[PDB]
Amino acid sequence: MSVSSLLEVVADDLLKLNNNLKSLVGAENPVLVSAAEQIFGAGGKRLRPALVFLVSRATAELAGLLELTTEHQRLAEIIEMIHTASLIHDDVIDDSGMRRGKETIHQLYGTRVAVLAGDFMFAQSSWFLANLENIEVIKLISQVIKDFASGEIKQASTLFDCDITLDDYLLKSYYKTASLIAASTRSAAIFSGVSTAICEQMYEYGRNLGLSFQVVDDILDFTQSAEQLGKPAGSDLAKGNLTAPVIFALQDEPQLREIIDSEFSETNSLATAIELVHRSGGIKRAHELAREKGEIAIQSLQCLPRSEFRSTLENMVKYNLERID
Template identity: 80%
Template sequence: MSIEHIKYIPDRNLSSHSQFVFMDAGKETIHQLYGTRVAVLAGDFMFAQSSWFLANLENLEVIKLISQVIKDFASGEIKQASGLFNSDITLEEYLLKSYYKTASLTSASTKAAAIFSGVSSSICDQMYEYGRNLGLSFQVVDDILDFTQSAEQLGKPAASDLVKGNLTAPVIFALEKEPELRDIIDSEFTEDGSLEKAIELIHKCGGIKRAQDLAKEKADLAIQNLQCLPPSKFRSSLEGMVMYNLERID
């Protein structure tokens, strides 16, 4: 196995360190195969490598843009860690955290590509919004799958975010309609069967459906952002990315 065959993701199990996974979902992670020490060293290597590539871009605006993503990642992790089992979390707080943890990278990447293409600042801004809305839609879809797919499909235990107290869109929507769910979350699932009951309530109260609507809403905004570009196979490819993401919950 070479370094080219693995992908970096923020680790949710190794404290503040990083881990690597195969490109196919559900595969074993590097820390499972080779241990935490190797996973952390691999993360350090990839971080150093990416920093080197960033410095060699020789475009100060893009360097600042991507550097902000690193700050956003840390902010997202702090927000998540400080809000576990907080049943008062609002949708706006959830979306902000999702921006920091996911959409910041996609929005910075799409704007950076626009900057390098030499287009106008207004198009650069629209491409930033495209990346932002695509990233938010992607995160919401991921959070839906946590409740609708099996552990084998996910490559991790189902509802793992909920177990750890990370309340996502389906939970937030369900909390608006079901007071019992709040009591269960506040108890941090200490009673037997409480997790299963919480998952049942989330489905029953329409939390999944409303989260699907949110993912589609962000996807529609991303498609609208692309109207700043002339029709072409390139714009079609960017639109295709948005639709491919939504197909994961069809």
């Protein structure tokens, strides 16, 4: 029911990881020391690294280990660095501003520093990955990076496409977020040394959790008040990016089709369309879809024996589903 109450079980490892990341990036460089401190914040932002640590401890308890190997820590760092670099470069791309205000580092430090820092993080992650010394995990992570790049390139060609399927949206969202979390859980299980079927189960867990997160984010984009963010709701809708509620609503109203195809030329077509979507009930169907994904994830977690990290993962699912309130 609260982020900190969830993460407190693995807080010390996260503290160590933040310290290591700080010391790693911008060693002795002043402007990059300040950027480094700002970029990783302090604790928190832990969903992906905390997930890594939780799955690590659960599978290690199953496999009778006594403590986390250093490879698990390296893996957590790799995941964190990749996600941070992705966010930074995404900010510089499509030139939008004030992500949750939090003047993006592109505004705070400028384009040069942002591009340089993104490159530095990518390079360090590659070096650590090569040091891991397990060719299969390397293949997985490389696949993830390539899919992210391809998805970025492809999203430009699908703007305002007035007919797209649920599968296409799911696969785009998979390339956007789910692949990283799925690969992380599977790699953690591999480093813990458990059976193969359990690794497949963990992969499915990661997939479905990532999908749930992404869908819930799209839903929040519609209902949130403009002050809780910058641009008022339906920003990406105006930009030409269709979301799940839009797809569900498009199966009912042609007027929405003409408004979209009009490239929102007529005045107040934006608010008209938002009210249309609210009236069509696409939000309820998106809610149900998110619930199905979460249910699949919970059932997948039934392979691990009783524990407290299990309850932590299930409560993570509940907190995700409850963020919509």
